[PDB]
Ligand binder design. Structure first.
Ligand SMILES: Nc1ncnc2c1ncn2[C@@H]1O[C@H](COP(=O)(O)OP(=O)(O)OP(O)(O)=S)[C@@H](O)[C@H]1O
Lengths: 372, 371
């Protein structure tokens, strides 16, 4: 329930010592904001600054200290956003090289970084999205956790507490190994991991269900191929619903894992070792397909992220398109650029001819010049 | 044993078996190469041979499917020698009206399972990677077949267990459609727990030996560490006292009644177990490369063979079903020497680029020594 259907909208952003960007305030437009310039001038840095306001981290996976302008002691980003319930919401993110970060919403300091989700909703499309198709469980897992956490605060809560308990269990393993004086205390942590692990598996399944439905729709439209998604959960359950059952299986598996865990000083059982497999027609897309369909599968995955996010939050997000509008024979552009219709979008490119923005910004040397 | 003579199939006689013509084949004690364009003929032969070990089709086919088209029966007769037998005759007769006749040295076996393992084979196939790739049931059935060949007590138990389970499951739907029958349930539960406990103890024993063999082969082939985790349905990982395993199984049977009534299935028991195959602490089903999966499949089978020899004192015949298709002829030569003092049957497409001691060409169901 919201007071309006005003889409998410970034009125302006202010960047101070952020990457190579000069200290500046940028005011944006409704519709397509074209950001163009030579390679390495600051295009992706600006998208990274905008995406920071949504996630509280670099979409590139960079450490915070890497976003600080070389030889400075802090960076600071401030966005003013409009959303369905807010004519204006101020979002501030300051980070100092000594580790101190200060995140504020409407002038109130957030107690943790995760509390920044999703005051400002974005979906970012990037060439590296094909890595979610190609790389290991870790990549897919990090992606899934972020998709869900953005729309579901209780899951994010669970994930945070799970990781905390996991960390405690792992250090306990060290303490048991470093002595003879502890295998025992593991039971109570085991019980907790199974409870939180089961809640997480349940929600991951709910999302993957929705993911498969939406992706099957998109895939069948542009490639006429058939999508399946297999969730390799840690409970070994091929069809997950009874949370009771999953809890017991996870707990049994933890107990049977004790010797192995003492050897590796880690926990092989749980959500943090899971994966999901993406199947095209019947084959594993990670291995059995070419680069045409991986790029296609990546697109469908992200199109689905967008669709699920809108439906679950009742908000319309801002779209970030990083270096994904090059190439593109133009019926393959005619499809996407019209799909951007009712959104505010930020599109990076090499030229301002190819794509027509409603507002256009040239960046050279970290300096952003509105209107070429 | 009175000796250490290897298992050796001197000859086989097939009558109305699949597409095979009626014929006697005589084999050598080394490499027997079977080749040809044919897909079925090459395999039908391996199926006849493997029948003499397992008393079933390794293709999962019903017996009636092994019978040639317009015929009323098939018949397979093998002559074998093993550590204690200069010659042992094994005959398998099946008529389409149903009656199986299995005989060893002229004596009829009262049950099909008694054929295990008068004649030991291990069969290698590209399909073996599915044991690494696929789900609990594929691993479970493989385990059951490996153990059953060695241990006929286990095979027995497994039959009584399976029979009891189906009865129990038929009863679950009576309890839910009518409103009674939990009295038989408690009786079935006691029976499932008893047999289940015996099954679990032996599986644990086997998987321990499997872990040791497999980890040795893997450490030598790839210098990676192998672990096996046996997820027994008693939820213990402390498996040698059948008494306590019974109690645990019985308890869990009780606690999952509601589940069982809903799905009309039985959630607790060895019929739902699994074991994890881990490389360097990570689940091979989830984290392992394609190469790693094939290597692990190899190690699994090398281990099956090592444990079978150690447990029985017999050296099995090796069946290599189309595993030479995609190899190098330096890797083809490698293996050939590793076969050493076994009898082996190898199916291929060509006659060269592998060495063998007896070559057979199968075309149109006739197996012809030498082309
Ligand atoms: N912390 C930092 N301080 C100063 N300069 C930085 C910092 N981090 C990166 N840079 C530089 O800033 C540039 C990065 O600009 P980007 O926006 O990534 O390039 P871009 O080509 O405009 O974006 P894409 O991905 O091609 S659309 C490079 O020249 C980096 O060396």
């Amino acid at each position: 329930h919201h007071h309006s259907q005003d889409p998410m909208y970034l009125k302006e952003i202010f960047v101070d010592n952020f990457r190579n960007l000069k200290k500046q305030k940028l005011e944006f437009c409704e519709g397509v904001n074209l950001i163009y310039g030579l390679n390495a001038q600051g295009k992706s840095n600006l998208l990274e600054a905008i995406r920071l306001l949504s996630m509280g981290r670099s979409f590139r996976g960079s450490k915070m200290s890497e976003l600080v302008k070389f030889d400075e002691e802090y960076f600071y980003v401030r966005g003013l956003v409009r959303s369905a319930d807010f004519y204006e919401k101020k979002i501030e993110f300051g980070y100092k090289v000594n580790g101190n970060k200060v995140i504020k919403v409407n002038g109130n300091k957030l107690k943790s970084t995760g509390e920044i989700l999703g005051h400002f909703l974005t979906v970012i499309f990037s060439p590296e999205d094909i890595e979610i198709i190609k790389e290991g469980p870790s990549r897919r897992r990090k992606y899934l956790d972020a998709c869900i956490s953005v729309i579901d605060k209780n899951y994010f809560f669970d994930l945070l507490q799970y990781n905390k308990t996991l960390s405690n269990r792992n250090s306990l393993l060290k303490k048991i190994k470093e002595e003879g004086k502890g295998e025992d205390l593991l039971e109570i942590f085991d019980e907790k991991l199974a409870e939180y692990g089961a809640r997480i598996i349940k929600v991951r399944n709910n999302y993957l269900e929705k993911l498969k439905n939406s992706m099957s729709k998109f895939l069948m439209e542009i490639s006429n191929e058939k999508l399946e998604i297999i969730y390799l959960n840690s409970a070994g359950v091929k069809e997950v619903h009874e949370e009771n059952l999953i809890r017991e299986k996870l707990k049994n598996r933890l107990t049977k894992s004790l010797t192995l865990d003492l050897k590796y000083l880690s926990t092989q059982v749980g959500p943090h070792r899971e994966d999901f497999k993406i199947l095209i027609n019947g084959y594993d897309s990670r291995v059995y397909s070419s680069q045409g369909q991986k790029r296609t599968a990546a697109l469908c995955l992200k199109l689905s992220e967008l669709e699920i996010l809108e439906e679950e939050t009742g908000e319309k997000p801002v779209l970030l398109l990083d270096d994904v509008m090059s190439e593109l024979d133009d019926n393959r552009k005619k499809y996407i650029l019209k799909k951007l219709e009712g959104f505010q979008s930020f599109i990076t490119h090499t030229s301002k001819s190819d794509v027509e923005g409603d507002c256009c910004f040239k960046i050279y040397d970290g300096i952003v010049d509105k209107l070429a």
